[PDB]
Structure 1
Amino acid sequence: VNSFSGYLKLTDNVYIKNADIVEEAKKVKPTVVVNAANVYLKHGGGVAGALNKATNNAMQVESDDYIATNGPLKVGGSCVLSGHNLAKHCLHVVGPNVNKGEDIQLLKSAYENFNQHEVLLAPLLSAGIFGADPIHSLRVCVDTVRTNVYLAVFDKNLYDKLVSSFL
């Protein structure tokens, strides 16, 4: 039993809710919140910009030190950093950004990072400003993640389309 509330159960392990991931994290304080990161951990917009804003830019400060030490992530890769005031940890995961020409096949590799964590709060990878089809992202999530994932979908209209089209 966990404290996630109001989710629709899609499969044995995948759950979904119309919610602002920032407000969800603040309420649940999950062990792991997933950020829709880029390889430079520049948290400018989309989910990343919103999460970072909620940390008063502390996520960005920590991220800049991480990059200065380690260099950029790989597309499809991840790193674990602090969750600041939102969660114990933040798993920064880089899905392919279609608006940069990146290979959508890397979306499965991106979701594989979730399997290193027993429970996660997460957005759909590569959705929104990363330009992928969210119906496709949800399908890859369900077919790749085996751990317990609670998906927050900000757009109510999109949430209804994902549910009604889910196979």
Structure 2
Amino acid sequence: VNSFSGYLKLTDNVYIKNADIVEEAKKVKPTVVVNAANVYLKHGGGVAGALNKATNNAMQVESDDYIATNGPLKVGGSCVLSGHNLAKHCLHVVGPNVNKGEDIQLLKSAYENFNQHEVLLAPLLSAGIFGADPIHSLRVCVDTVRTNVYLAVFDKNLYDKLVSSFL
């Protein structure tokens, strides 16, 4: 038993809710919240900009130190940093950005990072401003992640479409 509430169950291990991931994280304080990061951990907009804003920019300060020490992430890669006031940990995961021409096959590699964590609160990778089809992203998530994932979808219209088209 865990504290996630109001989710629709899609599969044995994947759940979905129309929710603002920032507000969901603030209430649940999950062990892991996933950020839709870029390789530079520049949290300007989308999910990343919203998560970072909710931390009063502490996520960005920590991220800049991480990059100064380690250099950029790989597309499809991840790093674990603090969850600040939102979660114990933040798993920063880089899905491919279609608006940068990155290979969509890397979306599966991105979701594989989730398997290193037993339970996660997450957005759909490569959705939103990353330009991928969220229905495809949901399919890859279901077919790749084996650990327990609670997907927060900000847009109600999109959430209803994801549920109604789910196979």
> What is the TM-score normalised by the length of structure 1?
1.00
Offset, 1:42: 0.0
Offset, 1:90: 0.1
Instruction: Find the aligned partners of 1:93 and 1:79 in 2 and give their Cα distance.
Output: 7
Q: Write out per-residue CA displacement over residues 33-65 of structure 1, whole angstroms, 9 at most, x where no aligned residue.
A: 000000000000000000000000000000000
Q: Write out per-residue CA displacement over residues 73-118 of structure 1, whole angstroms, 9 at most, x where no aligned residue.
A: 0000000000000000000000000000000000000000000000
Offset, 1:142: 0.1
Aligned to 1:5: 5
Gapped regions of structure 1 (runs ≥ 5): none
Q: CA RMSD in A?
A: 0.1
Offset, 1:29: 0.1
Instruction: Find the aligned partners of 1:83 and 1:73 in 2 and give their Cα distance.
Output: 18
Instruction: Find the aligned partners of 1:57 and 1:112 in 2 and give their Cα distance.
Output: 28
Aligned to 1:81: 81
Offset, 1:2: 0.1
Offset, 1:124: 0.0
Instruction: Find the aligned partners of 1:99 and 1:129 in 2 and give their Cα distance.
Output: 8
Gapped regions of structure 2 (runs ≥ 5): none
Offset, 1:67: 0.0
Q: Write out per-residue CA displacement over residues 106-142 of structure 1, whole angstroms, 9 at most, x where no aligned residue.
A: 0000000000000000000000000000000000000
Instruction: Find the aligned partners of 2:36 and 2:133 in 1 and give their Cα distance.
Output: 15
Aligned to 2:97: 97
Instruction: Find the aligned partners of 1:163 and 1:5 in 2 and give their Cα distance.
Output: 17
Aligned to 2:54: 54
Instruction: Find the aligned partners of 2:140 and 2:8 in 1 and give their Cα distance.
Output: 18
Instruction: Find the aligned partners of 1:139 and 1:151 in 2 and give their Cα distance.
Output: 12
Instruction: Find the aligned partners of 2:84 and 2:69 in 1 and give their Cα distance.
Output: 20
Q: Percent identity?
A: 100
Instruction: Find the aligned partners of 2:97 and 2:122 in 1 and give their Cα distance.
Output: 17
SS at match of 1:11: coil
